[PDB]
Design a protein around this nucleic acid. Structure first.
Lengths: 147, 240, 44, 97, 49, 32
RNA sequence: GGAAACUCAAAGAGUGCUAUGGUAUGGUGACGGAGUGCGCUG
């Protein structure tokens, strides 16, 4: 194989790491609520606090989201970076993300689940890391703007 | 009178030329459906159906600024987003044309001192919302320093011998750096003992003494005898 | 005993009310709601 | 107000002139907001019992915004509280002496 | 066997929001900054010029 | 020098300790 | 020459943003607070 092929492989491996400001902007402007110019200027604290509000709304609708408030939506997860822990911690949080996605697959018609999984999109990069489970979970909604 | 013209954009932004067999200097109309001083209008149907928008003929024998435009000025500073401080807004004759050249997103502060012209200015500024009429003497800019902030061009159609002092005071208060200073000098109203070139040279010297660098002057001769427009910019540091 | 009634009256006198330190200890219940030119002639 | 609350609750270690400084600059920036005048005078009467300065605060606030009736009502409330404390200390000095 | 490498983590070095400036970590080791006499000699010469 | 539970709670806040976070991610096991 | 773009770089111009240490917190128990005395202002 060729050098550009092997480098496309290392780009696909390092897809989520922000190695300068321009890649961080292009990578953090990928939101599910806001457009790119607002989404690039938002913080982690802002999107976390309104995603925690939306998870409280989603949890009082369906009470199986409270353990996701315990682990995936806690305040240690504001500073938890995805691509800094090993493969075993990665598989732990990726089956956490799979649990959240196949729990909240049914709830996709009501905006608290959009504002709640906004934080999985922007903190844990599940649109590019945990992407097969995201497509498979929301496959039903294909005539809808959320898909 | 019922004929058809083609509207075409001028070099200057915000003003147009209507070509027929005699071509007309033309501006867009900010208040469509009425004329302000009896000029003629042009109604185009631009393409919900198309809308009838209209245009007003700028008369160079009733506007020193239009006489300057169609004599040929290299740069007006009256532009379609700007703020113009019109000094000597003697009625709504040229202020309406400056107002709709400047457009809905820009502001024209029309300063006039007499009161029946001020009444007509306020009734015109109702249907042209981008006109702030200021009834005050321009020789004391502090009396209306609270109503105006940071204009981009001053236009001076005052006809007083203390013209350059009025222009300098209003520029030092409200004009920004490298902003426009357009002056209509009337030689006979400044003083009639000397000739027109002497009084234009003295007024240009007064402007550069009050640090307004003149870029350009134009005599505007077929429409007015012994007039001038001097276009300068407010340099504020380094005419050199 | 001979003045505890007026000490309680000083305790129950109407105090000066603000909303300023309550404004310091205020919290919010806020959600998040989702997300031609005048002068250009028409090109024919 | 979080600044003022932390600075007041710091206790003996802070200085009441340090609270006076931030009251002075806050009242300078917001003269029209009236609850700051009430809070300033309430801190300097209901904690320090400084009647002269409290009267000065209320008169300066009523100089600035003499339009909201809330400052008027809190001033008549302060004056009634001051005269009630005056006559109760008279009654107490009679009942003791 | 315990093992630890350099975890740079990219949250401390390139900022999340685009409106704010990048972090400039410092390290005052003279090993990191080698030509300390020549560099400020040339800065003093460029200052005199 | 014993430990303390309140001390270790706000110490886990102050030192930025994700140890209970990784414990919960390893523990939760998708029990529902 | 032409076309495409959530493509990759090299540069230019303009605009936006409190863009604010004229010599950086009230305080290394060497410290702070209270009070007194001196000093200062009208």
């Amino acid at each position: 194989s060729s050098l550009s092929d092997q480098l496309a492989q290392v780009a696909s491996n390092n897809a989520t790491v922000a190695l300068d400001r321009k890649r961080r902007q292009k990578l953090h402007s990928a939101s599910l609520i806001y457009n790119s110019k607002t989404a690039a200027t938002q913080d982690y604290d802002f999107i976390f606090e309104n995603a925690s509000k939306a998870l409280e709304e989603l949890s009082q609708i369906e009470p199986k989201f409270a353990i996701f408030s315990r682990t995936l939506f806690s305040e240690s997860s504001i500073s938890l970076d995805r691509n800094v822990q090993t493969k075993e911690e990665i598989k732990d949080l990726d089956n956490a993300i799979n649990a959240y996605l196949l729990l909240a697959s049914s709830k996709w018609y009501l905006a608290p689940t959009l504002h709640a999984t906004e934080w999985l999109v922007r903190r844990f990069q599940i649109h590019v890391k945990n992407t097969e489970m995201l497509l498979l979970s929301t496959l039903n909604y294909y005539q809808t703007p959320v898909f | 009178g019922g004929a058809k013209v083609v509207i075409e954009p001028h070099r200057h932004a915000g003003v147009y030329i209507a070509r027929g067999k005699e071509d007309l200097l033309v501006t867009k109309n900010m208040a469509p459906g009425e004329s302000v001083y009896g000029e003629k209008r042009i109604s185009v149907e631009e393409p919900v159906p198309p809308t009838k928008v209209e245009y007003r003929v700028w008369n160079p024998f009733r506007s020193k600024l239009a006489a300057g435009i169609m004599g040929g000025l290299d740069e007006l500073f009256i532009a379609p987003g700007k703020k113009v401080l019109y000094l000597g807004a003697a009625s709504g004759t040229s202020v309406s044309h400056v107002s709709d050249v400047v457009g809905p997103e820009g502001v024209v502060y029309a300063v006039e001192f007499s009161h029946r012209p001020g009444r007509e200015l306020i009734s015109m500024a109702k249907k042209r919302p981008n006109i702030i009429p200021i009834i005050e003497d321009a020789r004391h800019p502090q009396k209306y320093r609270m109503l105006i902030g940071m204009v981009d061009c001053v236009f001076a159609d005052v006809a007083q011998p203390d013209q350059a002092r009025i222009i300098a005071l209003n520029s030092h208060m409200f004009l920004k750096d490298q902003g426009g200073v357009v002056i209509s000098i009337k030689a006979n109203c400044i003083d009639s003992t000397v000739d027109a070139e002497t009084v234009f040279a003295r007024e240009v010297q007064k402007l550069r003494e009050e640090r307004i660098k003149p870029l350009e002057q134009l005599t505007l001769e077929p429409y007015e005898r012994d007039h001038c427009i001097v276009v300068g910019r407010y340099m504020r540091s380094g005419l050199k | 005993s001979k003045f505890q009634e007026i000490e309680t009256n000083l305790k129950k006198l109407p105090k000066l009310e603000t909303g300023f330190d309550a404004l310091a200890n205020k919290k919010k219940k806020k959600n998040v709601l989702p997300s031609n030119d005048w002068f250009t002639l028409p090109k024919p | 107000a979080m600044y003022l609350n932390y600075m007041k609750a710091r206790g003996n270690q802070t200085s009441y002139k340090k609270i006076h400084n931030i009251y002075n600059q806050l009242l300078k920036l917001h003269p029209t907001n009236v609850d700051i005048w009430i809070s300033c005078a309430k801190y300097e009467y209901e904690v320090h019992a400084n009647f002269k300065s409290c009267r000065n605060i209320f008169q300066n606030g009523l100089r600035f915004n003499p339009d909201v009736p809330k400052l008027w009502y809190e001033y008549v409330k302060f004056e009634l509280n001051f005269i009630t404390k005056l006559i109760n200390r008279r009654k107490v000095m009679g009942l003791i002496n | 066997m315990k093992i630890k490498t350099i975890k740079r983590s990219a949250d401390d070095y390139v900022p999340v929001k685009s409106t704010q400036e990048s972090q400039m970590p410092r390290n005052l080791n003279p090993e990191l900054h080698p030509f300390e006499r020549a560099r400020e000699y040339t800065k003093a010469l460029n200052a005199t010029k | 020098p014993p430990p303390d539970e309140e001390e270790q709670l706000l110490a886990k806040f102050v030192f930025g300790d994700t140890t209970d976070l990784q414990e919960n991610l390893a523990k939760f096991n998708a029990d529902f």
